Amino acid sequence: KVCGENSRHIFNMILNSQRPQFDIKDIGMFHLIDEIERLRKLWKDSEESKKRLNADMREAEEALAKARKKLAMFDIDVKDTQKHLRALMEENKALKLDLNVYETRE
């Protein structure tokens, strides 16, 4: 009778009135940042390994480049030395033939 129904309804709403509050730890803000930092290390560790592997790769490519030039020279050297061998064999054959003719004549 004395306390109006309107008065009660409002007092109840105010008592039950709430933001309601979002605690930052509860909604996951610190957890979200933890995950960002966790991803940073995973990305950096992969990039570090990618940095280090790239230097091993360029070294292999450079040594491969030096070897193939040497492979080009050796092919020239092999054929040329074989030709020098043939000339000396022919000189050797001829010198022996001369010596063997002249000795039989002596």
């Binding site: 306390c3 409002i10 007092f11 008592l15 709430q18 979002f22 509860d26 909604i27 995950e35």
Partner: protein, 107 residues
């Protein structure tokens, strides 16, 4: 000024109608998982967006709706109380005028 009897009857009558409630409506939903299992775990990132969307939509955009009910109801309540203050003043002045007028009838 308020009589002491009206005072005690009102306060007690308000308190006996007060009901504190937790149906869980104004509670915050629990978060999913915040850890990516691998570099292909886009489901977890989706679950994060889903939670954040659930969160922001839940109260901050939405709880301004039921809280507006309090703001509008309190507004009409107080405008009504403030108007009755002038209605009271008018009725008292009208009562005083009739007091001075009742005497003339005697003469």
């Amino acid at each position: 000024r308020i009589p002491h009897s009206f005072f005690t009857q009102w306060n007690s009558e308000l308190d006996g109608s007060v009901r504190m409630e937790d149906d869980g409506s104004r509670e915050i939903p629990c978060p999913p998982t915040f850890c990516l299992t691998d570099c292909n775990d886009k489901d977890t990132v989706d679950s994060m967006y889903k939670y954040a969307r659930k969160l922001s939509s839940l109260q901050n955009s939405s709880e301004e709706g039921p809280s507006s009910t309090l703001l509008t109801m309190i507004r009409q309540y107080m405008m009504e109380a403030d108007y009755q203050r002038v209605e009271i003043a008018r009725l008292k002045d009208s009562l005083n005028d009739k007091d001075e007028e009742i005497k003339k009838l005697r003469g």
